[PDB]
């Protein structure tokens, strides 16, 4: 219920907690993937806009590590678009939430950012609440009847729903399971390029909170102000991997197909390329602190330059974790039954 | 809702009661089963002169009979990591709850602490409440806009949820059935070494008093 | 809500109602079936009478 008439004063912001979407998701792909989001754009100033609403443009950004997935409040920026900064949670209000464009991820020719994916999600809404303040556009009078007494002035219809997810069960987990890909869905049938792969996961089933109670002064009678209450949050991860080497004879039909596709998986191969010889290679010092006037700067030329270096990821080394004998691992035995060997 | 504002005071506790995480599970292996649990650590060297927030570590241990399972507040100590013992019910406020390390028992070479294991678990929240103490961490200011007068005081954000297991049925029964050895996970195929075995189980549907 | 202090009395009984568990089962036998029920039994003879 919501009775009449209107109460309000200057500002009436309150304290609430809430919770969010239940999900499980994953992606495999050698090329790095993108991810779209919404944001304000440049509008025409040649119109006499009686409305004052700014436009909204989709920005097909490239997903970094530790940036934010969508939660269900618009896939928009929240720094430049929530001027109040006190309506959307603090964790996301100075960030931007994202979603994947699976169909534009389906519209890549080769299919190197997608090798496989899944997603498992459930949600229903518990509560319902609304906003205040000067609402943008008013109501047209000719779709209702008016009144007075308590029914004098109109009330703001600036509502919003509240997500509540679902139950968090283990009976439909997707982790801890082998997935032997029989056939990849696109043209790239699971082959990595440039000796790399980028994988991700977002899960809410493992998202508990780690608080911390620290009494600063011992006493046998209780005071609230003995306690500098802290909070942490922990997460534990691992991966397994089984590969297969493959032989590529560099024929003319292939070498025109691939250099045109990507010259960068030829530059590590340097077949018929004049710069990777060069001359005398890099000549290092031993480290001297004050003298040897050069410094640790990047004005020396980079042996590897890419805008992916401008983004920050979780760098995971596997140049040393290789093994030919596989039965000593709990998936190698799971493979020989799978391969029938 | 929260009608403003939070009030000062040093003593505001009360009795409440709530259920826990439900499960059914077991494990078998001819070595006793292990388990991690989180605790404190050594602080540091005193190079940092910033603040006081305590260290931490998980602790890998073979669990024995009687020890407590974690129910959602992390597998951790309630005496050392907490300090009021009033966030936690009395039976578990003086405990060091663990979670089993099937992971390192999977990366165990032979698999002698594991022959077979089961698990079935589900959960969802009941309500949302908040702690009552000095929040040791402050919140940055430009992330939001502060209010004034009655809304001049910034209330704390030390929220905490409270659990609920789902409905259970007799179709969700794990026990009282045969689970045949035909293929074990590791190198020890059912072989009890030392003519001994280490069996465990945790049930919640027969947990009334 | 169970907030402090008490508002007790020398009498505190009330009219309430509750619902139960959903039973559907089969049982057959040409021999009579038993049940179990906890009976108030005795300990040994002298337990020092600390708590009854």
């Amino acid at each position, epitope marked *: 219920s919501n*009775r*009449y*008439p*209107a*109460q*309000p*004063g200057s500002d*009436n912001r309150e304290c609430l907690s809430m919770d969010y979407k239940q999900t499980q998701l994953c992606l495999i792909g050698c090329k790095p993937p993108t991810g779209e989001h919404w944001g304000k754009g440049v509008a025409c100033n040649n119109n006499a806009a009686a409305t004052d609403c700014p436009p909204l443009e989709l920005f097909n950004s490239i997903i970094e590590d530790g940036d934010m997935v969508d939660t269900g409040f618009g896939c928009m920026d929240f720094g430049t678009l929530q001027a109040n900064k006190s309506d959307v949670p603090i964790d996301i209000c100075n960030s931007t939430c994202k979603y994947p464009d699976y169909l534009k991820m389906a519209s890549e020719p080769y299919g190197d950012s997608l090798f496989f994916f899944l997603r498992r999600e459930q949600m229903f809404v518990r509560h319902f609440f609304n906003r205040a303040g000067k609402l943008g556009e008013a109501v047209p009078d000719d779709l209702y009847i008016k009144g007075s*007494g*308590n029914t004098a002035v109109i009330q703001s219809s600036a509502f919003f729903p509240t997500p509540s997810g679902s139950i968090v069960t283990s009976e439909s987990q997707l982790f801890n399971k082998p997935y032997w890909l029989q056939r990849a869905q696109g043209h790239n049938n699971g082959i990595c390029w440039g000796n790399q792969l980028f994988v991700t996961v977002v899960d809410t089933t493992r998202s508990t909170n780690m608080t911390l109670c620290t009494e600063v002064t011992k006493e046998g009678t209780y005071k609230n102000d003995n306690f500098k209450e802290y909070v942490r949050h922990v997460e534990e991860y691992d991966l397994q991997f089984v590969f297969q080497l493959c032989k590529i004879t560099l024929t003319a039909e292939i070498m025109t197909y691939i250099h045109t596709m990507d010259s960068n998986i030829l530059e590590d191969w340097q077949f018929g390329l004049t710069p990777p010889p060069s001359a005398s290679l890099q000549d290092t010092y031993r480290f001297v602190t004050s003298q040897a006037i050069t410094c640790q700067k990047t004005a020396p030329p980079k042996e590897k330059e890419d805008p992916l270096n401008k983004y920050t990821f979780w760098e995971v080394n596997l140049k040393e974790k290789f093994s030919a004998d596989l039965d000593q691992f709990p998936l190698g035995r799971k493979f020989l039954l799978q391969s029938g060997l | *809702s*929260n*009608r*403003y*504002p*939070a*009030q000062p005071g040093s003593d505001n506790r009360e009795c409440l009661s709530m259920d826990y995480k439900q499960t059914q599970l077991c494990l078998i292996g001819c070595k006793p089963p292990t388990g991690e649990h989180w605790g404190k650590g050594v602080a540091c060297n005193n190079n940092a002169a910033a603040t006081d927030c305590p260290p931490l570590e998980l602790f890998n241990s073979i669990i024995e009979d009687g020890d407590m399972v974690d129910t959602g507040f992390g597998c951790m100590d309630f005496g050392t990591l907490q300090a009021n013992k009033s966030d936690v019910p009395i039976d578990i406020c003086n405990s060091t709850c663990k979670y089993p390390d099937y992971l390192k028992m999977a990366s165990e070479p032979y698999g002698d602490s594991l022959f077979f294991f089961l698990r079935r678990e589900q959960m969802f929240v009941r309500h949302f409440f908040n702690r009552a103490g000095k929040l040791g961490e402050a919140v940055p200011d430009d992330l939001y806009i502060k209010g004034s*007068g*009655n809304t001049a005081v910034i209330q704390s954000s030390a929220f905490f949820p409270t659990p609920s297991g789902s409905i259970v049925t007799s179709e969700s029964q794990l026990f009282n059935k045969p689970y045949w050895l035909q293929r074990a996970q590791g190198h020890n195929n059912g072989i009890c070494w030392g003519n001994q075995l280490f069996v465990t189980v945790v049930d919640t549907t027969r947990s009334t008093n | *809500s169970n*907030r402090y*202090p008490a*508002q007790p009395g020398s009498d505190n009984r009330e009219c309430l109602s509750m619902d139960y568990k959903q039973t559907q089962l089969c049982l057959i036998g040409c021999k009579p079936p038993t049940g179990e029920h906890w009976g108030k039994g005795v300990a040994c003879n002298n337990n020092a009478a600390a708590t009854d």
Partner: antibody
Amino acid sequence: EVMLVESGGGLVKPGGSLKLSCVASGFTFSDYAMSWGRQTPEKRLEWVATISSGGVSTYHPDSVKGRFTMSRDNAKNTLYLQMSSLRSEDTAKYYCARGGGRYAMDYWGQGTSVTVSA
Amino acid sequence: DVQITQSPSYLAASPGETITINCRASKSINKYLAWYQEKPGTTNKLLIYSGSTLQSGIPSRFSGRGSGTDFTLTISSLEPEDLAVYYCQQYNEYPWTFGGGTKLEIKR
């Protein structure tokens, strides 16, 4: 029918305690704020205690700090005031209040004389 | 504390005319101000909260205004249930102090 019926105010030893109870007849007690305020003679109406719609926000003035503790019951529709170690200044006529608004009061009962004397 | 006082403390009036009441402030306790009345045996009534904004069931003959430290409230077209004592009360900060009180009397 919205009516806040006062109960529990009268004579009490100096340095003693007493239990007040402001039973409401009918509404939903969890929706609206509730409060305590007294009237002392030759002085203003003295706000003793306030509480919010559910019970989150309770406050007392400088006169009764540390000595007075406010409570409420939402099911028996009753607002409370547990005070300790009363003095002769607490002799007055006391109202309990219903808050129907932005901490604004639209009700009190007929009240009872809460007099700390001999 | 906030020490607000209510003046003039007494009103003798005949109805239909226009009657003014005031309350001045010690601090800048800007426009958060309600107004009450005490009839014995019945309940207190909130006429206007926040100085200018109206409660359920409250009619339009009341009028109150002011900001900063100055306030003005004015009433015409009276009705015979009005004879009571009226208060102003700050709630901009705790403790919630009151005005001195104004009793309205009818002239005969």
